Amino acid sequence: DAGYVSQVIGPVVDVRFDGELPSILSSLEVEGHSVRLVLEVAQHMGDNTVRCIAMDSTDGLVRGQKVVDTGSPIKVPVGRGTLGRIMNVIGEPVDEQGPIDAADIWSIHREAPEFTEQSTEQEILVTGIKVVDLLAPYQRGGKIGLFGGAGVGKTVLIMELINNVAKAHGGFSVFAGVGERTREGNDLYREMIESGVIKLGAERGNSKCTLVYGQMNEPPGARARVALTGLTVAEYFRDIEGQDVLLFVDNIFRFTQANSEVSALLGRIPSAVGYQPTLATDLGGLQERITTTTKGSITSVQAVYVPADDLTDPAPATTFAHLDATTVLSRSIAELGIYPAVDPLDSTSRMLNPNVIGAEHYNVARGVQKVLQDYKNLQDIIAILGMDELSEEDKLTVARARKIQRFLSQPFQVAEVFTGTPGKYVDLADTISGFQGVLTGKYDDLPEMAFYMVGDIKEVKEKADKMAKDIASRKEADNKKVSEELKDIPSLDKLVSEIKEVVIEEDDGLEEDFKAEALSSETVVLNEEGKSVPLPKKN
């Protein structure tokens, strides 16, 4: 009827069933653990033994511990009752607010939609980010990937896309945090409380996001399945509710990395760089479920961490093919202080087609990429010569491209808490016309750093005015400035007097709550009866 633990090697448990083996992908429950330990069946080892991956830690598992079968995969709560909640891999609430009151719980494992139910509609998703909306324009109902190394700004870009799209969407959102920092999971939760996207208490049903979190502190069996849980909530909203869903996945790289972390313990000899031999089919089996069928539409934005800034690592190089749009963030753009650090060349979109976004948008996009590639080819002869023998056209294609590089930068609304500048939403037409101006040459009369961290084309023109009133100023230097003392300034010993007093009592708070138990000097062990007995005197 039930099974028992046969073997525990880290996060992979062998469970032996005397008859009635579970199916593969079945979730099993370990009865008698400290916490709820869920094992998901991975393979049939062969002598009435299945091999599972644990959703929690396996420290505490005894061999022969009774493991019971639920007859089904990991089923999570889905529906309206999950909006404005935080869930586990297994659908437990981790937000301390009751249980989840969602109806018709769903398995986290299903096949992808068929070839017959594939949508080919291509409408542009306007993001308000002028480098995304110009050079790699997103598709609503499309699969979007924000590639990049560590620290180039994938999470701040996904937060700006949340702030710009998910609040003004109408449908629902699902953030699926896959193996990320718990600090930024809390930051996302708090700033979606403050935005109204998550409401607590009596108006919980007015929320517009379901958080599903599988962060870095969780074992590899949990990070390898939490994307399926977020995808199951989104697939309920797409298939049953018939909605337009917005799936946001932070580091889908951690899905493949967490599958790779258990891959040798599941008994598979490793492929190239060190990933599992099933890397492409695991990633494909996740990514093909994120589609718009004819029923509803899932627009997914996925952050994809590229390891050591290497875009040819097989975990980004495999997920390149599953994406309609692609926003390659690079470190080289970010070392110039240009944010978002989108590589304007290495980014690509399926929408960048003159039949899709219009030939007027297409030609200014291709012209920006043309002048940027020409400047990228001229930099090598500039650094040898010195940019004074460039034929007055290649002094123009350097100046225009260096204006464009600054004009691709933008202040973000979610990035004003560590930069200070408030963020600008830029419309699509004011992006297209603004870049067409700098391309054809209307704005060579503006200085070059006037294009840096601005919004429209109406803001570089007035940043030039502020810069040229400020470089017109700083010419008076004599007196009646702040440095004089009878202006408003008290005496310096007067300002020490207004300091309020804080006390120091030199006991630093260690004699107030501690239960100091007396630890054993001797080793105390268990005999064959399990009795706590001191270690026997024989070596």
């Binding site: 199916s23 992908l25 393979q43 062969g46 031999p277 599953h322 023998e389």
Partner: protein, 478 residues
């Protein structure tokens, strides 16, 4: 047989006493499988689908027959999966016949010299790396550089010229999509129906959520479906998009069957895999029908590193190579064909004879332009034997640009290349790029296209009229 172990799409099956290597089996669950490595104690069966419906002790039946797909004219226009079954939802494949997916390639005597040209409609490919019927040409490049564009333009141009040739010299295309997304296959079926190309295009599709044996086996399905047309005296064109994904699916199966890995964990017989696939694209002898099959494998490099394992293997196998760079792509040169690194070992023996006498100048002065390529970025002008080739090579690279999904007939590419290699160039200031590239083919009278297509050669009686026609081109926007 009885399932011993099952996991990661591999079922170890005890029993199945007289089962063949590569033979189909069938499980209790209705899923199929292919018996790949037969051992003395079990059979390693790769599973054609999701292995979660297989349990230990499930019964496996052998079907007695090797893996085979339906071939024939009923497959034209249908989107099939990697095993031949149609996934477009128009019912079963009428008017077909089962035939094995692993056949032997035609030998030395069954071959013929590759002499007749296969036009792709890309003027870079038709002018510089010309394709013959029976050639294997590698479309190699990095990601997002336009490889599917060159393949799709070849298919669409085969539709365009299939309407104006007799029944014999028509090319029926097969596009094999290995490991692609399912949403981007539907966009290709949309483009091929809207183009009209599905009247001659079979569409074999093993997507990313398919099993690894289906993606491994889909190029052999597509090659059997196109070998129908090769073996009945007609002409085929097979396109394996990302053969580098078929190799990854094969690596997955061979590693999970615990076969000993080689370089980049590929099995030892992955060269045998791809050469066993790609040697079936042949121009048959006059006795076997005279039919042909032209393959375009697509291999994705990573950083232009063609010294990778699968890329070197397929570069060794195929005749030519169409190398698409990413730096030419963002520089405006689209199709981004690297002229110096793109080869065709068939060469000039199988191109248009009217293009062969014009393109021999073109590749020579493109080479001259490539060696004098640093001087384009200079202010000090040199001795005007280099500035001449600089402006000439610049207008020649701007000559070979081409928009997507709009292939050109071969007589029009010949005329547009003649108008740039004989010196009818826009040697004006280049404000008139808008009304001079297409103005040559739109303002000469179309009778020169009829004569050049039907004779296949610019005769002395025709370059006279073509030179007389090229001088009277208007461009009245100036």
């Amino acid at each position: 047989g009885r399932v011993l172990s099952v996991g990661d799409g591999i079922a170890r099956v005890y029993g199945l006493k007289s089962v063949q290597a590569g033979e189909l089996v069938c499980f209790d669950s209705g899923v199929k499988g292919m018996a790949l490595n037969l051992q003395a104690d079990h059979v390693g069966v790769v599973v054609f689908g999701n292995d979660s419906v297989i349990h230990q002790g499930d019964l496996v039946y052998r079907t007695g027959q090797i893996v085979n797909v339906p071939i024939g004219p009923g497959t034209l226009g249908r989107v099939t999966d990697g095993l031949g079954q149609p996934i477009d939802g128009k019912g079963p494949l009428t008017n077909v016949r089962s035939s094995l997916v692993e056949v032997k390639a035609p030998g030395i005597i069954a071959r013929q010299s590759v002499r007749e040209p296969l036009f792709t409609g890309v003027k870079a490919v038709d002018a510089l790396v010309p394709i013959g019927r029976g050639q294997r040409e590698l479309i190699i490049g990095d990601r997002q550089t336009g490889k599917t564009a060159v393949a799709i333009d070849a298919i669409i141009h085969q539709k365009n010229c299939n309407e104006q040739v007799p029944k014999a010299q028509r090319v029926y295309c097969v596009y094999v999509a290995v490991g692609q997304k399912r949403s981007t296959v539907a966009q290709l079926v949309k483009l091929f129906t809207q183009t009209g190309a599905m009247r001659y295009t079979i569409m074999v599709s093993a997507t990313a959520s398919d099993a690894a044996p289906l993606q491994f086996l889909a190029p052999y399905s597509g090659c059997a479906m196109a070998e129908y047309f090769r073996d009945t005296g007609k002409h085929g064109l097979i396109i394996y998009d990302d053969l580098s994904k078929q190799s990854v699916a094969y690596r997955q199966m061979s590693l999970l069957l615990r076969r000993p890995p080689g370089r980049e964990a590929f099995p030892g017989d992955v060269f045998y895999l791809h050469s066993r696939l790609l040697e079936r694209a042949a121009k048959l002898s006059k006795e076997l029908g005279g039919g042909s099959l032209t393959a375009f494998p697509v291999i994705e490099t990573q950083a232009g590193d063609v010294s990778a394992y699968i890329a070197t293997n397929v570069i060794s196998i195929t005749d030519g190579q169409i190398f698409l760079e990413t730096e030419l792509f963002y520089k405006g040169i689209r199709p981004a064909l690297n002229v110096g690194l793109s080869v065709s070992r068939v060469g000039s023996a199988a191109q248009f004879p009217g293009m062969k006498q014009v393109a021999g100048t073109l590749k020579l002065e493109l080479a001259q332009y490539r060696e004098v390529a640093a001087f384009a970025q200079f202010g000090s002008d040199l001795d005007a034997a280099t500035q001449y080739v600089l402006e000439r090579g610049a207008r020649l690279t701007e000559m070979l640009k081409q928009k997507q999904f709009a292939p050109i007939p071969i007589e029009r590419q010949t005329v547009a290349v003649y108008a740039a290699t004989k010196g009818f160039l826009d040697k004006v200031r280049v404000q008139d790029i808008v009304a001079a590239e297409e103005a040559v083919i739109s303002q000469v009278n179309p009778a020169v296209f009829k004569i050049l297509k039907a004779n296949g050669k610019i005769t002395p009686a025709l370059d006279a009229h073509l030179k007389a026609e090229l001088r009277k081109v208007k461009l009245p926007g100036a």
